[PDB]
Amino acid sequence: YITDMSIEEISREWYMLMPRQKITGGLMVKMDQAIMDKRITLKANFSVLFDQLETLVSLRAFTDDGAIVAEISPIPSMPGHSTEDVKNAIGILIGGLEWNDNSIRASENIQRFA
Amino acid sequence: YITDMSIEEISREWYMLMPRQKITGGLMVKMDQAIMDKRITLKANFSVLFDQLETLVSLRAFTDDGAIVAEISPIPSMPGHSTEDVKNAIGILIGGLEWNDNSIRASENIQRFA
């Protein structure tokens, strides 16, 4: 099991100026269209089996000022999913952010297991 | 050499309310951020060689409305783009559009050669 976020930072209620979402694999992917020209920093809490991602808890995206603008949590009702599902939820999100000229950096673990 | 687009279509000028344009290779994807939940159809005029694509002249995207909301055109300063470039511009455009809950359909010719 791995962690990039304070139990606080993962339990922090957050909201969007311009809500967007996309449901993939077993993964909900939300992200605020309002954000542009910022650095976004990706932090995932997740589990691992045999040196590889096993299950995602939450990935959240922070700005320089530590605000969260996008999350990638499992589906509430129907969460079962693989890790190949995750790499895509991320491509998806990252893709959306970079459309608004934001530049993206990812947690170290996030790059090891994805 | 293939043409989904009547000359009027590929020549006509067109506008956006929430413009956004990414770059990839020698190609310039612009899209109107202001469009939500519309069906978009991709028509592309392009040159083919053998049984695969050669040079995009342009790819525009239309609502059932006939209005063009996106365009993947070759950058004038450097004009050269690649086959793979085009594959990327398109994926990028789908993705950027599909965030606004838009549904896409591609011309036969596009699906055939890309």
Residue numbers in the entry:
A (entry chain B), B (entry chain A): 89 to 202
What sentences appear in the manuscript?
During infection the influenza A virus NS1 protein participates in multiple protein-RNA and protein-protein interactions to perform a plethora of functions. Present models of the tertiary and quaternary structures of NS1 indicate that the protein possesses two globular domains, each capable of forming independent homodimeric interactions.
Previous studies using recombinant Alb/76 and Ud/72 EDs have shown that a single W187A amino-acid substitution is sufficient to prevent dimerization. However, at this same concentration we routinely observe complete dimerization of the PR8 and Alb/76 NS1 EDs.
